[PDB]
Amino acid sequence: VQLQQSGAELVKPGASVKLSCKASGYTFTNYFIYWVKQRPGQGLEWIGEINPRNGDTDFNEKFESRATLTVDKSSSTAYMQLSSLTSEDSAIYYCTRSPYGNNYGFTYWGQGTLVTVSAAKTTPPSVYPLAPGCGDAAGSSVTLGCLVKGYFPESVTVTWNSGSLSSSVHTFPALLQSGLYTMSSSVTVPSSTWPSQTVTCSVAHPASSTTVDKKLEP
Amino acid sequence: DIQMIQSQKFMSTSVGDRVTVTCKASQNVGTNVAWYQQKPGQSPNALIYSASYRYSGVPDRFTGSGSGTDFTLTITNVQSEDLADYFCQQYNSYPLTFGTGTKLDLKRADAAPTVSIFPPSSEQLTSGGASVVCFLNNFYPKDINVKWKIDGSERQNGVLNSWTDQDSKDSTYSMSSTLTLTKDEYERHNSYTCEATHKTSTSPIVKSFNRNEC
Amino acid sequence: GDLQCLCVKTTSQVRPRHITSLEVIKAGPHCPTAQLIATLKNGRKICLDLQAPLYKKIIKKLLES
Amino acid sequence: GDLQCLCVKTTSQVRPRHITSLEVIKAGPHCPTAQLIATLKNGRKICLDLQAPLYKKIIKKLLES
């Protein structure tokens, strides 16, 4: 990957958060770097640009104070702190690129980093197995879920058997429950052979760093 | 700050339709326009620049139009893969401005929500609570209502649901009916049934499990 | 994806009767965008703008001596 | 202060037969590295190394005409 990015996290209002961005090739020193946050509800907003060679910038006037860019020629690195948060700073940030230096659209982007503002009570993720059994289970395609609720902060990904059947994948959005979050996921699988093969849902929560994978059987 | 007025924000079309993403400029930018493609839950991919000139490795289907204050993005043939989001751009004056976005939905074979019953977790009796879920998937449209049936009655203490963004291969949503009940009231009742009233079937499709045996 | 684009930024000052070649390198696997490199009278390669009717006009000044 | 280098990757492995033309560009203001591009017989451009003595290997084979 050419434009990697930092981890996703939340912080308290009126604070400071430092980001990171790396690149690969001479396509750093010459090209102008750009930062943008995705609401994603309202839309996209521009923060500013920054020359890698010199250091001269040109931020947006509405969000100038809530911005600080320092480009280091260490290893093609680009950082951004935030001068005092509010509550509208809840947006996922990107480290974009452009092909003709500072013009002609935005080619490369990157994975991104999700940032929110609340500072509620932190809670590790709660994982619970959801299988049939005892009922009927008989059919052509018996689908199963894995509940991942009661967690804090955000950033969660669950994968079934590393990707046994990627067709028709399910990803149920997080619900704000008791200052925490409530998430769930499932996938479709043929009932051709079920009582034989082992299925484990791999749960990731890099915001608090916890991993729980449980075995599924009727 | 200039802003780019996008008249349409929520659209929907069939397999192979001509779509026109309406995007008009507040002040003059002069051809310095760009269109993008935001994949559901993914970074916006570079689509086309200057409402004419296409990037490297972009299909023939995409076509830009108009100049100055008026711009238009058109698309000839659409596939299951082309389902996503599309944004608008201008690059002539700093600060540079974006827009709002215009989503789309592909029209195809309509589905009925294949619901499955799920008994509460075995760990729920060692933590303090209850988790009864009826996972429903592959259905149309996104508008549905959740109902319950316990011992003939119903509860709505904490039924929190969430809809998925339709898959890029079937174009159908999915909902999960999460419950947050206590331990004592749960154990007392026996029969548990979840009702789902929709246009696909006159009577709500349920799936029930008995507290006995299980 | 080894090789990359051969341009950085556009040029303001444009001398219609001081240029020789105009390499119009279209978008490719290397550079994600098209290119308009011109060679000057003294042999100095520069990049130009696409959008504006630059070339539409520059061609004449090249073709008519 | 425009005009970026054409090469980003050095590379050394290549067919001494299937090739057309080769050029070496001096370390200019716009491009600081020693450029060494060669146009492929199929219609592509590739780069090379300085201290890798395989560039000479091909040159000779072309003068055999």
For residue C9, say whether it is annotated as part of any ligand binding site. no
Shared-domain flag, residues B7 and B99: yes
Measured CA to CA in angstroms, residue A48 lies from A95, A207, B89, B94 at distances of 11, 27, 15, 9
Nearest to A148 by CA among A198, A186, A112, A120: A186
Q: Does C52 touch chain B (CB under 8 A)?
A: yes
Q: Does C33 touch chain D (CB under 8 A)?
A: no
Shared-domain flag, residues A112 and A139: no
Question: Is D2 close to A101, i.e. CB distance below 8 A?
Answer: yes
β-pairing, A113-117 vs A9-11, is parallel
Which pair of tokens denotes residue D14? 């290549």
Which pair of tokens denotes residue B124? 């729920």
Spatial distance between the Cα atoms of B26 and B135, rounded to a whole number of angstroms: 46
Spatial distance between the Cα atoms of D31 and D46, rounded to a whole number of angstroms: 16
For residue D19, say whether it is annotated as part of any ligand binding site. no
**Chain A: closest CA distance from residue B89 (Å):** 8
C9 → closest Cβ in A25, A26, A102: A102
Question: Is B46 close to C32, i.e. CB distance below 8 A?
Answer: yes
The CB-side HSE value for B112 (13 A sphere, CA atoms) comes to 12
C4 → closest Cβ in D3, D8, D46: D8
Nearest to B158 by CA among B133, B139, B123, B141: B133
Q: Does C4 touch chain D (CB under 8 A)?
A: yes
CB-based touch D/C (3+ pairs, under 8 A):
yes
Q: Does A209 touch chain B (CB under 8 A)?
A: no
**Chain D: closest CA distance from residue C37 (Å):** 9
DSSP assigned state of D9? -
Question: Is C51 close to B30, i.e. CB distance below 8 A?
Answer: yes
Shared-domain flag, residues B104 and B119: no
Spatial distance between the Cα atoms of B32 and B115, rounded to a whole number of angstroms: 49
Spatial distance between the Cα atoms of A158 and B196, rounded to a whole number of angstroms: 26
Mutation to test the C interface, candidates B29, B53, B71, B90, most C Cβ within 10 Å:
B53
For residue D58, say whether it is annotated as part of any ligand binding site. yes
Nearest to A194 by CA among A161, A175, A211, A217: A217
For residue D59, say whether it is annotated as part of any ligand binding site. yes
Give B20's strand partners: B74
Domain around C29 = 1-65
DSSP assigned state of C55? H
B56 → closest Cβ in C28, C51, C52: C28
Between CA C49 and CA C57, with CA C53 as vertex, the angle to 5 degrees is: 110
B43 → closest Cβ in A109, A134, A173: A109
Between CA D32 and CA D40, with CA D34 as vertex, the angle to 5 degrees is: 125
Domain count, chain C: 1
Q: Does A134 touch chain B (CB under 8 A)?
A: yes
Domain around B192 = 109-214
Which pair of tokens denotes residue B102? 């215009």
The CB-side HSE value for B65 (13 A sphere, CA atoms) comes to 10
Q: Does A140 touch chain B (CB under 8 A)?
A: no
Chain C residues inside the 8 Å CB shell of B32? 51
- Can you spell out the DSSP letters for chain B? ---EE-S--B--B-TT--EEEEEEESS---S-EEEEEE-TTSPEEEEEETTTEE-TT--TTEEEE--TTEEEEEES---GGG-SEEEEEE-SSSSPB----EE--B---------EEEPPPGGGGGTT-B--EEEEEEESSS--EEEEEETTB---SSEEEEEPPPPTTT--EEEEEEE-B-SHHHHH---EEEEEEBTTBSSPP---B-TTT-
Q: Are A68 and A80 in contact (CB under 8 A)?
A: yes
Which chains border C (3 or more CB–CB pairs < 8 Å)?
A, B, D
Shared-domain flag, residues B134 and B213: yes
What end-to-end distance do the CA atoms of chain D give, in Å? 42
Chain C residues inside the 8 Å CB shell of B34? none
D9 → closest Cβ in C2, C8, C10: C2
Which pair of tokens denotes residue B186? 């749960």
Domain count, chain B: 2
Shared-domain flag, residues B3 and B102: yes
Measured CA to CA in angstroms, residue B46 lies from A105, B37, B58, B92 at distances of 8, 6, 9, 18
Which chains border D (3 or more CB–CB pairs < 8 Å)?
A, C
Estimate to the nearest angstrom the gap between the alpha carbon of A24 and the chain centroid. Answer: 22
Question: Is B56 close to C31, i.e. CB distance below 8 A?
Answer: yes
- Write the secondary structure of A147-193 as one string of H (helix), E (strand) and C (coil): EEEEECCCCCEEEECCCCCCCCECCEEEEEECCEEEEEEEECCCCCC
Spatial distance between the Cα atoms of B32 and B50, rounded to a whole number of angstroms: 5
For residue C61, say whether it is annotated as part of any ligand binding site. yes
Q: From B108, B140, B156, give the residue that closes a domain.
A: B108
Q: Does A202 touch chain B (CB under 8 A)?
A: no
D45 → closest Cβ in C3, C45, C47: C3
β-pairing, B33-38 vs B85-90, is antiparallel
Spatial distance between the Cα atoms of D65 and C16, rounded to a whole number of angstroms: 42
Report resolution (Å) to 1 decimal: 4.1
Helix (H) or strand (E) holding A9: strand A9-11
Estimate to the nearest angstrom the gap between the alpha carbon of A111 and the chain centroid. Answer: 8
Domain count, chain A: 2
Residue ranges of chain A whose CB lies within 8 Å of a chain C CB: 25-27, 30-31, 99-104, 107
CATH code of B194's domain:
2.60.40.10
Shared-domain flag, residues B98 and B121: no
**Chain B: closest CA distance from residue A177 (Å):** 9
Give A78's strand partners: A71
Chain D residues inside the 8 Å CB shell of A25? 8
Q: From B60, B90, B108, give the residue that closes a domain.
A: B108
β-pairing, B33-38 vs B44-49, is antiparallel
Domain around A19 = 1-119
CATH code of D32's domain:
2.40.50.40
Q: From B108, B127, B144, give the residue that closes a domain.
A: B108
